[PDB]
Amino acid sequence: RLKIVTIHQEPFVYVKPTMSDGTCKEEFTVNGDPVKKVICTGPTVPQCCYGFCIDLLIKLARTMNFTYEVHLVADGKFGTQERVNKKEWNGMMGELLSGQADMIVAPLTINNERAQYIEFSKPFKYQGLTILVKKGTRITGINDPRLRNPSDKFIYATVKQSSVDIYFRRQVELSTMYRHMEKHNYESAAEAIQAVRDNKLHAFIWDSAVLEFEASQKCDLVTTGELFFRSGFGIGMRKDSPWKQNVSLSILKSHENGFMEDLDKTWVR
Amino acid sequence: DNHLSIVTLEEAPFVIVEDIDTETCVRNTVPCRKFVKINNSTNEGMNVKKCCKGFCIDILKKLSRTVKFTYDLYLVTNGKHGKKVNNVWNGMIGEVVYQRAVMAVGSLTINEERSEVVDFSVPFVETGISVMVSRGTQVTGLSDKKFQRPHDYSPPFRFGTVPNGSTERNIRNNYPYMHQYMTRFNQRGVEDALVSLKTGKLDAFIYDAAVLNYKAGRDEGCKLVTIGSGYIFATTGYGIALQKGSPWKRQIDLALLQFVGDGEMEELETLWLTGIC
Numbered sequence: 001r002l003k004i005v006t007i008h009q010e011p012f013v014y015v016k017p018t019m020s021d022g023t024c025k026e027e028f029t030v031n032g033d034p035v036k037k038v039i040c041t042g043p044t045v046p047q048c049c050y051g052f053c054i055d056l057l058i059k060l061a062r063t064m065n066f067t068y069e070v071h072l073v074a075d076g077k078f079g080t081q082e083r084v085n086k087k088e089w090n091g092m093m094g095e096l097l098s099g100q101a102d103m104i105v106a107p108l109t110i111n112n113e114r115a116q117y118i119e120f121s122k123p124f125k126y127q128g129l130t131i132l133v134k135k136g137t138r139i140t141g142i143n144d145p146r147l148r149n150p151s152d153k154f155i156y157a158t159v160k161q162s163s164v165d166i167y168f169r170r171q172v173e174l175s176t177m178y179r180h181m182e183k184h185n186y187e188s189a190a191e192a193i194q195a196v197r198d199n200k201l202h203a204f205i206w207d208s209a210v211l212e213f214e215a216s217q218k219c220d221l222v223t224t225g226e227l228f229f230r231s232g233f234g235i236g237m238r239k240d241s242p243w244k245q246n247v248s249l250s251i252l253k254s255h256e257n258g259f260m261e262d263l264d265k266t267w268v269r
Numbered sequence: 270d271n272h273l274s275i276v277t278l279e280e281a282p283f284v285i286v287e288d289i290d291t292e293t294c295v296r297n298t299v300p301c302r303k304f305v306k307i308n309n310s311t312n313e314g315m316n317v318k319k320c321c322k323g324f325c326i327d328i329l330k331k332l333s334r335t336v337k338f339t340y341d342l343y344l345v346t347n348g349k350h351g352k353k354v355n356n357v358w359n360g361m362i363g364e365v366v367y368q369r370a371v372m373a374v375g376s377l378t379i380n381e382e383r384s385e386v387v388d389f390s391v392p393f394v395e396t397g398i399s400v401m402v403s404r405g406t407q408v409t410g411l412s413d414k415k416f417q418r419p420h421d422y423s424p425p426f427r428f429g430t431v432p433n434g435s436t437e438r439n440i441r442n443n444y445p446y447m448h449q450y451m452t453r454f455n456q457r458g459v460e461d462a463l464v465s466l467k468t469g470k471l472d473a474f475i476y477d478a479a480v481l482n483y484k485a486g487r488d489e490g491c492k493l494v495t496i497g498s499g500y501i502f503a504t505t506g507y508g509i510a511l512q513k514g515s516p517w518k519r520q521i522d523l524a525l526l527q528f529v530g531d532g533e534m535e536e537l538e539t540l541w542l543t544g545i546c
């Protein structure tokens with residue numbers, strides 16, 4: 001029984017209360033397909049989990065004939081490496097490396113820092129980084145005076161302990177943006193999006209797969225319409241894990257299948 | 270050794286082949302040999318020295334420096350990217366599987382079948398099945414109803430691919446009636462199809478996304494355009510192929526993810542792949 005860790009991140013993972021008898025509300029999509037739901041424990045309590053990555057997990061489980069239990073990452077983060085002197089990963093990265101999880105099934109960005117320590121599958125989603133604002137804000141994108149000349153009149157941020165945190169902290173050229181950013185970053189994409197809707201936050205630098213979906217659903221938000229960096233999501237396993245090979249073949253087959261396009265149609269577009 | 274036999278394949282702008290001379294290779298280019306046949310009824314031939322440059326050659330240059338290896342680069346002579354014929358692989362993939370090369374560098378698409386007989390690095394550029402049309406034409410991508418059931422429209426869309434490769438094979442397996450329909454619009458090659466599009470004899474051309482992005486980038490007058498990247502079908506990437514269980518895979522993967530994260534890949538993309546449009 002594989003221990004799968006994941007994270008709240010619509011549209012890839014929705015997290016909903018169970019019904020009174022601890023089961024999950026049976027739903028269909030507008031186009032008549034069943035909405036597959038799995039029970040996921042999370043911060044202590046069982047909940048209902050569904051979405052792009054859950055459909056992906058289910059397909060994977062059936063393809064390679066394994067059972068699983070799903071839990072949400074204890075500290076709510078994707079994962080960066082911090083100083084304790086020794087070092088440790090937080091977020092889902094830390095859970096996977098410690099054995100709290102056997103596999104990360106999440107919108108988990110593939111990058112060189114994490115690939116040092118874990119195995120990624122071939123990407124299950126190709127996307128990138130963009131910027132989300134509130135309708136009525138008019139910036140031009142990553143290069144714009146209010147972003148490269150930051151000040152307290154225009155607050156912009158990303159998610160704490162994420163790949164985007166990694167990305168802005170590792171590059172000397174982003175030092176000025178990172179200094180303004182690290183004093184405003186949020187605990188979760190949801191809180192930062194709801195902060196833009198509340199006008200407390202002015203720009204949110206995050207994954208385009210999420211941000212473009214947020215705009216399409218919430219009229220009061222809009223993105224730049226431009227990717228400034230491209231990256232992919234992968235399934236995460238421990239080093240030399242015996243699943244890595246078939247997980248990847250299964251991801252590739254599912255792109256070539258049309259299956260990944262079906263998920264994109266169901267969840268993203 | 271840290272000295273590697275590497276196979277490649279000509280396909281501009283990823284790999285571009287030139288003659289020598291003085292009679293050596295000038296900078297930007299690295300040496301690459303090709304076994305040229307005497308005639309079509311003998312195995313006899315001559316190894317001709319050529320000069321190779323391009324997006325993927327630059328990748329190879331960085332990998333060589335970062336992962337620290339030397340190499341003999343040669344061009345595939347039998348096949349193109351890699352096709353299993355009667356369970357016998359040709360192309361770049363065949364060089365690797367049959368151990369004449371430990372590495373294949375070029376416009377080589379990562380796919381499931383090849384991944385069973387070779388290992389693939391992380392993808393260094395995105396690709397997939399995309400669609401190119403004349404500016405103004407409205408299509409969502411391969412799975413558009415205009416393609417899946419062409420006669421649901423009057424007149425029916427005229428669309429095709431270049432047959433005998435991965436696009437035709439993918440379509441044949443996923444959309445049997447589309448494949449049956451579009452056979453009549455088979456294009457001899459990419460440039461043929463571009464001319465057909467611009468002369469109004471073809472409404473859409475279904476092909477490799479990275480190639481179609483590059484063509485539209487440099488199209489004269491910018492009249493030919495591709496669908497958005499959100500609508501590429503069966504997204505994957507070009508990757509480097511290695512022998513099964515290769516010990517070079519991990520450091521290649523780290524170097525490629527390094528180049529992506531630090532801006533080096535984007536600069537090669539600007540240097541080789543972006544155009545006016």
Ligand SMILES: N[C@H](Cc1cc(C(=O)O)nn1-c1ccc(CCCF)cc1)C(=O)O
Binds near residue numbers: 351379396476
């Ligand atoms: N790079 C070529 C493949 C390329 C040439 C052709 C052609 O000539 O038909 N079409 N493609 C292509 C087809 C399908 C996909 C996604 C499905 C498989 F991964 C990506 C690129 C190669 O390596 O073969």
